[PDB]
């Protein structure tokens, strides 16, 4: 009844440092049309089981989508560290949700090199869970301040993914979706087949 | 905010910026090498220029951080790699003069004419002819018309390079070349530039008797082809050694064969009578590599690589090469046919590729071999192991009723000795002469005298025609006209047999070492990948000690490899003289 279709085959996905959030409510959740797609590399679910997802319901469900590398997919998990798990997107230790990813070489790759996907590699401190950063202020490494212009020990904080079709499997684009389940004092409204 | 966090951030940024440019340059180079047109040269040159400019600009900024303030090891090696600078510490005019000299020298060697150009014409005459005068005139003409015109350029070259080397806190340009073997580590794993000369000199005194016996069987077998031009007690003339210079003696097999009736093992017919194509060759190579515990080739290997000539009117060079473009891209380019030599070069290049995939996890600056001699020695042992009768009998190209005759073994060993043992004195003499010339020990007015005296004393080869100081004989070689180091081959030859004996011992093999096969031995291939993953992140003493158990070069395995040939060669010299007296010259009368 609700679009778990406009999150999965959308034309354009978002960068990892600016990850898009979509909330689904007042609907019937069909989780069998996803697990039997046979086109998903990873279908790991934490805190619940994929078989019992149809029985117990919740109030709200949150969906986040972005694009990362092939060998950075394993960092989307509780208690994992790395370049993208502390500066771009973090998950709490007590997680209840699913992580879904699949290969996207046929779409997000060009011969001249796609350059519209970015990620952040410099930051002063780690990110709290479910926190997003958009600022592009120049990063300061030394004690001598630089006034808004990059120079010695002053670096721009974002860099681009050079996706090309000839890259290896570990350097090819992957599309990742994360679902989280919300249960609070509001009435439970999202659940499906009877 | 210390002098380590800044270096770490700088290294992060450099590592993530260099990959893009390197990949683009490699892609452009491959595209040009696959088509060779007029529009691809522009792109290749643009990519190369941009990459070089970026590297120079970044290496300029990396010298602002001192080395002694960093306590970690990997970061110290990364800064040491990024802080090297050659020809960038000179005045602009001197650099321009040096570049002009180098370009002129390379061009003048490239298009030399003797009276037929070198590459198509003179090489065939040197390789195939059997006439004394026919070889003599070509040799003398090439040397006179090339060396005489190259003397002042090389006289200026040594002075300019000495100035460049001294500007970088070095003692000599030869001392600058020897720095590729220098190490700095804990107590038991250091290495200095001075010890390389002593290490090379000691290893050469343990090879002389075998070389003397090989010299005395060739001298004695060429009595017949040339009746009255070579003395039974003198040195061999330089223009009767199978090449223009004498670097390899491999073209003397038809003249010096122990038993000329029994042929060698050739499996071209038993391979064409089974409809084998190139894909079968590479599949067999992959099966051999996966039978020893190493992984399989990627899917992009089979789609992007070139393994045959294109017959659609596109021009290619396709000298066999192995490419590591980056970002998980591995390709092999070869114009494959259905002979046995291609079947062995397939294994060689697959070994080259297998070494590259191991250290892809290391940082950008540490993705190379331990030193300049490891990367070729790794690929040579695969070809050594993949040409034994056991492997051919298991594959199917050789019938199971085959019999291993000892005369064929002697033939094989003699051919291998002519290929391998005959080139060590040449390399040692050339490198020693270049080091002594650079160091200033040799006066500028006695170059050719020292050159030919050293030839007579060490390699036992004499000139057919006397030469004054107006010539330049070393410059006729390719690696001297274009500045390249030449000590790689000695070390590679030692290392390959070191590794082969170690792995054959691990495989529990019995009998002579030249009949060793490491197929279907997971332990042997599992130990070898321990050093392949290290790359350049640890000193090459670690890399040597992990596999063989020693921290220095040893020539004992090489002599153990040629033991049956040493035993048989010693017996046929009873009624002959071993050694040479350097008082005989073929113009005395
Ligand atoms: C996103 O779009 C693709 C097609 O672009 C959908 O693939 C369809 O899958 C269903 C089964 O789930 C098939 O019956 C259809 O034939 C497929 N193609 C089309 C064009 O519909 C995919 O299911 C969509 N994702 C969703 C709905 O979550
Ligand atoms: C590694 O370093 C040590 C010490 O710096 C070298 O050992 C010295 O070698 C010189 C050689 O002339 C001797 O005179 C010293 O007495 C040695 N000192 C000690 C404490 O042993 C060692 O040679 C170096 N390793 C290599 C391979 O050169
Ligand atoms: C490849 O060699 C085989 C081995 O002898 C040849 O096979 C013989 O071929 C003749 C004529 O076709 C037959 O009458 C024989 O019975 C074959 N002998 C055996 C044992 O195979 C063959 O001719 C060669 N090439 C091919 C396949 O034609
Ligand atoms: C590397 O990839 C090759 C691809 O062919 C694998 O070879 C296949 O292996 C399976 C069993 O794992 C066989 O059923 C196939 O017949 C093999 N293919 C061919 C063409 O022979 C090989 O196994 C892979 N290596 C590893 C270690 O998994
Ligand atoms: C480059 O080579 C491919 C085949 O190797 C060919 O199809 C293509 O036309 C070549 N490029 C040009 C510009 O002709
Ligand atoms: Zn090679």
């Amino acid at each position: 009844l609700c679009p778990f279709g406009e999150v999965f085959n959308a034309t354009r996905f978002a960068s990892v440092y600016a990850w898009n959030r979509k909330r689904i409510s007042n609907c019937v959740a069909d989780y069998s049309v996803l697990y039997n797609s046979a086109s998903f590399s990873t279908f790991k679910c934490y805190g619940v089981s994929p078989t019992k997802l149809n029985d117990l319901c919740f109030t709200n469900v949150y969906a986040d989508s972005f694009v990362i590398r092939g060998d950075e997919v394993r960092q989307i998990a509780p208690g994992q560290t790395g370049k993208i798990a502390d500066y771009n997107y973090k998950l709490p230790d007590d997680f209840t949700g699913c992580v879904i990813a699949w290969n996207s070489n046929n779409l997000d790759s060009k011969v001249g090199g796609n350059y519209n996907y970015l990620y952040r590699l410099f930051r002063k401190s780690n990110l709290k869970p479910f926190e997003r950063d958009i600022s592009t202020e120049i990063y300061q490494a030394g004690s001598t301040p630089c006034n808004g212009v990059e120079g010695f020990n002053c670096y721009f904080p974002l860099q681009s993914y050079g996706f090309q079709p000839t890259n290896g499997v570990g350097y090819q684009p992957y599309r990742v979706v994360v679902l989280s389940f919300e249960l609070l004092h509001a009435p439970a409204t999202v659940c499906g087949p009877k | 905010q210390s002098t380590e966090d800044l270096v770490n951030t700088f290294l992060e940024k450099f590592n993530y910026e260099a990959e893009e440019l390197s990949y683009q340059s490699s892609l452009a180079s491959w595209n040009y090498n696959t088509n060779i047109t007029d529009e691809n040269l522009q792109k290749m040159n643009n990519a190369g220029a941009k990459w070089s400019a970026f590297y120079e600009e970044q290496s300029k900024l990396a010298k602002t951080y001192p080395l002694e303030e960093i306590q970690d090891s990997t970061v110290k090696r990364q800064l040491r790699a990024l802080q090297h600078s050659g020809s960038s510490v000179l005045s602009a005019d001197k650099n321009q003069r040096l570049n002009t000299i180098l370009n002129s020298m390379s061009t003048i060697y490239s298009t030399g004419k003797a009276c037929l150009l070198l590459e198509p014409g003179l090489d065939d005459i040197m390789e195939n002819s059997k006439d004394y005068n026919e070889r003599l005139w070509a040799w003398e003409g090439w040397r006179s018309e090339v060396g005489k015109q190259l003397r002042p350029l090389y006289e200026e070259y040594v002075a300019l390079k000495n100035e460049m080397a001294r500007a970088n806190n070095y003692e000599d340009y030869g001392d600058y070349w020897r720095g590729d073997y220098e190490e700095e580590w804990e107590n038991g794993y250091n290495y200095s530039r001075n010890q390389l000369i002593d290490d090379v000199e000691h290893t050469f005194t343990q090879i002389m008797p075998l070389y003397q016996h090989l010299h005395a069987y060739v001298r004695t077998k060429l009595m017949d082809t040339y009746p009255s031009y070579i003395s039974p007690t003198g040195c061999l003339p330089a223009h009767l050694l199978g090449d223009m210079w004498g670097r390899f003696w491999t073209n003397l097999y038809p003249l010096t064969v122990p038993f000329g009736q029994k042929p060698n093992i050739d499996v071209t017919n038993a391979m064409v009578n089974q409809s084998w194509d190139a894909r079968k060759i590479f599949k067999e190579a992959e099966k051999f590599f996966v039978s020893v515990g190493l992984p399989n080739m990627t899917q992009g290997f089979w789609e992007n690589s070139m393994l045959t000539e294109p017959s659609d009117s596109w021009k290619v060079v396709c000298h066999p090469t192995a490419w590591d473009l980056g970002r998980g891209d591995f390709r092999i380019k070869m114009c494959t046919k259905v002979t046995m030599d291609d079947f062995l070069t397939a294994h060689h290049e697959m070994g080259h590729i297998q070494y590259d995939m191991a250290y892809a996890a290391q940082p950008f600056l540490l993705r190379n071999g331990a030193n300049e001699g490891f990367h070729e020695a790794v690929g040579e042992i695969m070809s050594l192991s993949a040409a034994t009768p056991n492997h051919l009998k298991n594959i199917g190209l050789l019938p199971p009723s085959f019999f291993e005759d000892s005369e064929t073994e002697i033939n094989f060993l003699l051919k291998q000795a002519l290929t391998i043992v005959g080139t060590l004195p040449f390399t040692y003499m050339l490198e020693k002469w270049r080091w002594m010339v650079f160091k200033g020990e040799i006066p500028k007015d006695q170059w050719m005298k020292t050159w030919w005296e050293m030839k007579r004393n060490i390699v036992g080869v004499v000139e057919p025609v006397p030469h004054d100081e107006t010539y330049c004989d070393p410059a006729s070689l390719f690696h001297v006209a274009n500045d390249y180091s030449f000590i790689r081959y000695y070390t590679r030859t030692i290392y390959q047999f070191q590794f082969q004996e170690a792995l054959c011992q691990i495989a529990k093999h019995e009998g002579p070492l030249h009949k060793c096969d490491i197929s279907n031995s997971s332990e042997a291939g599992q130990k070898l990948l321990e050093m392949l993953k290290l790359g350049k992140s640890k000193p090459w003493t670690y890399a040597l000690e992990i596999v063989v158990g020693a921290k220095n070069m040893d020539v004992r395995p090489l002599l153990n490899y040629f033991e049956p040939l040493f035993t048989w060669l010693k017996e046929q010299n009873r009624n002959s003289f071993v050694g040479w007296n350097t008082d005989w010259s073929p113009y005395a009368d």
Side-chain angles (χ1 to χ4, degrees):
Chain A
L1 189 69
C2 62
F4 300 77
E6 295 297 327
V7 176
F8 269 83
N9 50 39
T11 61
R12 288 196 291 271
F13 269 57
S15 299
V16 60
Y17 87 105
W19 44 271
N20 176 34
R21 167 153 279 190
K22 181 64 162 309
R23 62 177 293 165
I24 299 173
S25 55
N26 303 315
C27 165
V28 289
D30 301 336
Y31 295 129
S32 173
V33 304
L34 282 179
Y35 172 65
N36 293 329
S37 69
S39 68
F40 293 158
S41 77
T42 54
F43 203 75
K44 302 176 183 287
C45 291
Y46 311 94
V48 296
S49 171
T51 54
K52 307 157 113 169
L53 270 167
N54 296 284
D55 304 359
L56 184 49
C57 315
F58 318 87
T59 73
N60 282 329
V61 293
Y62 283 113
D64 302 324
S65 68
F66 50 87
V67 173
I68 62 173
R69 251 168 64 183
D71 51 346
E72 296 170 352
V73 171
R74 60 190 170 100
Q75 306 187 25
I76 307 292
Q80 300 300 321
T81 180
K83 301 301 290 187
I84 204 163
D86 48 30
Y87 291 145
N88 290 125
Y89 184 90
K90 206 179 186 104
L91 272 183
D93 204 350
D94 53 349
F95 185 51
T96 53
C98 297
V99 187
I100 301 168
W102 73 95
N103 193 351
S104 170
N105 201 12
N106 293 338
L107 311 174
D108 300 74
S109 296
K110 292 174 186 177
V111 286
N114 216 352
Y115 292 132
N116 49 5
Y117 292 112
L118 312 159
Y119 66 113
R120 171 185 298 270
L121 75 164
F122 290 131
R123 211 180 181 275
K124 284 285 186 181
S125 183
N126 281 13
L127 284 180
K128 304 173 174 181
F130 292 143
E131 188 183 0
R132 195 198 299 161
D133 205 335
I134 307 299
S135 55
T136 65
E137 171 64 33
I138 284 179
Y139 177 74
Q140 203 69 226
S143 57
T144 304
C146 55
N147 296 117
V149 59
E150 63 273 11
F152 211 58
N153 300 139
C154 295
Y155 302 118
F156 198 75
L158 306 160
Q159 208 176 338
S160 70
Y161 275 123
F163 288 133
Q164 289 206 16
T166 59
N167 288 347
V169 177
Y171 287 69
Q172 279 168 8
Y174 275 60
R175 292 167 159 193
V176 182
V177 185
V178 181
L179 302 168
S180 56
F181 301 124
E182 197 175 3
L183 185 68
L184 73 164
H185 279 277
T189 56
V190 63
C191 59
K194 184 191 178 305
Chain B
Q1 189 194 303
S2 306
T3 48
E4 179 161 339
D5 295 331
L6 305 153
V7 172
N8 288 334
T9 307
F10 176 78
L11 282 185
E12 282 253 32
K13 173 98 183 161
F14 181 82
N15 283 331
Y16 280 112
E17 281 285 331
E19 278 176 0
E20 175 101 80
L21 304 168
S22 178
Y23 187 85
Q24 278 181 1
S25 173
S26 78
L27 200 53
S29 185
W30 165 275
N31 277 342
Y32 168 77
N33 283 274
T34 312
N35 259 320
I36 297 94
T37 57
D38 292 347
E39 61 188 5
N40 296 23
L41 284 169
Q42 199 79 255
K43 295 166 76 172
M44 187 178 83
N45 286 333
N46 294 337
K50 195 170 182 180
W51 163 246
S52 65
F54 172 76
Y55 197 82
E56 294 293 327
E57 189 265 340
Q58 283 290 274
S59 76
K60 183 177 181 179
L61 267 67
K63 288 179 181 177
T64 60
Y65 311 113
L67 276 184
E68 298 297 326
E69 269 76 12
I70 291 181
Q71 312 294 313
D72 196 2
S73 61
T74 68
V75 168
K76 201 165 179 175
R77 280 189 173 91
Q78 295 191 53
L79 287 178
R80 273 196 162 173
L82 206 61
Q83 272 174 16
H84 198 194
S85 57
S87 72
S88 163
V89 300
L90 285 192
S91 180
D93 59 357
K94 295 273 182 66
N95 279 335
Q96 293 167 338
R97 184 80 180 98
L98 184 83
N99 290 335
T100 52
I101 286 172
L102 267 295
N103 273 346
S104 75
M105 179 152 50
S106 173
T107 297
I108 198 183
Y109 165 70
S110 66
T111 67
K113 293 286 292 190
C115 295
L116 295 174
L117 192 150
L118 167 70
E119 209 282 331
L122 283 188
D123 274 348
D124 284 346
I125 296 170
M126 284 298 169
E127 284 178 349
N128 282 335
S129 178
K130 286 177 169 184
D131 177 77
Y132 190 94
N133 301 19
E134 269 184 345
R135 302 174 76 98
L136 188 65
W137 74 261
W139 196 79
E140 194 263 337
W142 166 261
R143 191 180 166 178
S144 68
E145 267 169 351
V146 177
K148 292 208 81 173
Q149 199 172 1
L150 265 174
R151 183 70 178 259
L153 311 179
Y154 212 69
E155 292 168 1
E156 284 288 335
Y157 166 84
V158 57
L160 283 175
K161 289 283 188 173
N162 273 318
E163 192 81 24
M164 179 183 74
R166 289 181 184 167
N168 286 313
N169 217 35
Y170 283 106
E171 277 81 6
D172 177 27
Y173 192 56
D175 195 76
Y176 174 90
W177 270 342
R178 294 192 291 261
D180 202 68
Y181 298 97
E182 167 84 39
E183 283 170 343
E184 279 201 335
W185 193 257
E186 290 170 350
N187 266 341
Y189 301 92
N190 52 320
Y191 206 99
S192 64
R193 325 199 288 257
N194 281 334
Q195 207 202 5
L196 182 72
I197 306 179
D198 306 345
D199 280 332
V200 165
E201 276 164 352
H202 181 54
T203 46
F204 186 71
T205 51
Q206 294 190 320
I207 318 183
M208 277 303 284
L210 180 69
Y211 183 66
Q212 282 160 338
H213 285 291
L214 201 72
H215 189 265
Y217 184 70
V218 165
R219 183 177 58 186
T220 189
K221 298 300 279 190
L222 277 70
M223 292 290 132
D224 307 68
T225 58
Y226 311 101
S228 64
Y229 290 101
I230 58 172
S231 181
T233 180
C235 318
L236 297 182
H239 70 96
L240 300 177
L241 295 172
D243 281 328
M244 177 62 75
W245 314 273
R247 169 165 142 92
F248 301 111
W249 289 8
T250 175
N251 284 277
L252 274 79
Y253 190 76
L255 303 190
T256 76
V257 64
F259 305 97
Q261 293 307 105
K262 296 182 189 297
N264 76 295
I265 297 194
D266 168 50
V267 292
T268 307
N269 292 354
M271 169 177 160
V272 183
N273 195 3
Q274 291 175 356
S275 184
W276 279 35
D277 56 327
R279 266 198 195 159
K280 271 173 185 170
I281 287 302
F282 280 84
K283 287 177 115 73
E284 295 284 348
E286 186 186 35
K287 289 162 74 174
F288 161 81
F289 265 92
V290 65
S291 73
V292 297
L294 279 72
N296 52 11
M297 293 301 153
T298 59
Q299 191 205 0
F301 174 82
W302 296 109
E303 296 175 351
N304 314 119
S305 64
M306 154 169 288
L307 307 177
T308 186
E309 278 265 344
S311 64
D312 63 358
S313 77
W314 298 132
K315 286 182 169 180
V316 292
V317 181
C318 70
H319 192 67
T321 53
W323 294 68
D324 180 17
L325 282 72
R327 285 181 180 167
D329 201 357
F330 305 102
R331 315 184 188 192
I332 294 188
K333 182 258 288 179
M334 181 167 68
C335 283
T336 306
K337 298 171 179 51
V338 293
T339 48
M340 198 181 67
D341 51 8
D342 291 357
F343 172 70
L344 300 182
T345 60
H347 291 84
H348 192 67
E349 307 292 331
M350 287 266 290
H352 271 285
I353 283 289
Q354 276 287 345
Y355 193 12
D356 294 355
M357 303 197 294
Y359 56 67
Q362 302 279 334
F364 186 74
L365 277 296
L366 312 175
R367 281 171 200 169
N368 207 2
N371 59 76
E372 48 188 8
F374 274 33
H375 205 278
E376 185 67 40
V378 159
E380 191 70 30
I381 57 181
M382 307 317 190
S383 168
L384 264 180
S385 297
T388 183
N390 298 329
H391 190 75
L392 296 189
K393 179 183 292 192
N394 282 335
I395 284 306
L397 309 177
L398 187 64
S401 61
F402 177 86
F403 178 79
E404 312 96 337
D405 210 338
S406 69
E407 274 79 6
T408 303
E409 294 297 323
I410 286 293
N411 284 313
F412 177 70
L413 281 181
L414 184 60
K415 192 187 288 183
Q416 286 261 325
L418 277 181
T419 315
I420 287 181
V421 176
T423 195
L424 295 168
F426 188 83
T427 301
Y428 172 71
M429 192 272 308
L430 190 142
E431 266 301 324
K432 199 181 184 184
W433 184 88
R434 269 206 303 198
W435 286 342
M436 288 199 286
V437 159
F438 281 145
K439 201 174 180 181
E441 194 266 338
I442 284 175
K444 202 172 196 63
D445 307 339
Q446 297 168 359
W447 275 6
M448 291 304 111
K449 294 177 185 179
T450 56
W451 176 264
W452 276 113
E453 181 182 352
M454 286 178 63
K455 275 258 200 188
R456 290 159 168 247
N457 266 339
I458 289 153
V459 65
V461 161
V462 71
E463 69 273 353
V465 167
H467 288 276
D468 62 343
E469 281 289 328
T470 56
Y471 288 77
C472 195
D473 181 70
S476 61
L477 201 76
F478 168 79
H479 302 81
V480 185
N482 311 334
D483 49 351
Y484 285 119
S485 185
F486 207 52
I487 208 62
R488 280 177 262 195
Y489 306 111
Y490 202 96
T491 54
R492 186 255 308 171
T493 303
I494 308 292
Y495 292 155
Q496 62 160 303
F497 289 118
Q498 200 82 256
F499 293 157
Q500 185 70 13
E501 192 194 7
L503 290 194
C504 203
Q505 191 72 37
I506 299 158
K508 284 171 189 171
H509 171 246
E510 293 177 350
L513 183 59
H514 69 277
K515 300 198 299 186
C516 186
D517 203 330
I518 64 176
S519 313
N520 286 320
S521 171
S522 64
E523 308 162 355
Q526 192 61 237
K527 191 160 185 57
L528 191 65
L529 62 89
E530 281 177 355
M531 68 168 286
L532 302 193
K533 291 179 177 178
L534 293 178
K536 210 189 278 286
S537 73
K538 275 179 180 174
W540 66 266
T541 47
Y542 279 162
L544 200 54
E545 199 264 330
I546 276 173
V547 162
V548 72
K551 305 172 197 180
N552 211 337
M553 293 178 286
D554 205 350
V555 67
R556 208 74 38 77
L558 180 138
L559 297 176
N560 198 30
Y561 180 91
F562 287 98
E563 190 69 81
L565 184 68
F566 196 42
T567 58
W568 183 75
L569 285 201
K570 193 184 291 184
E571 196 73 276
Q572 316 273 338
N573 291 307
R574 295 288 300 277
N575 316 119
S576 284
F577 175 47
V578 182
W580 52 85
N581 289 338
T582 53
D583 298 336
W584 194 99
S585 63
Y587 42 90
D589 50 309

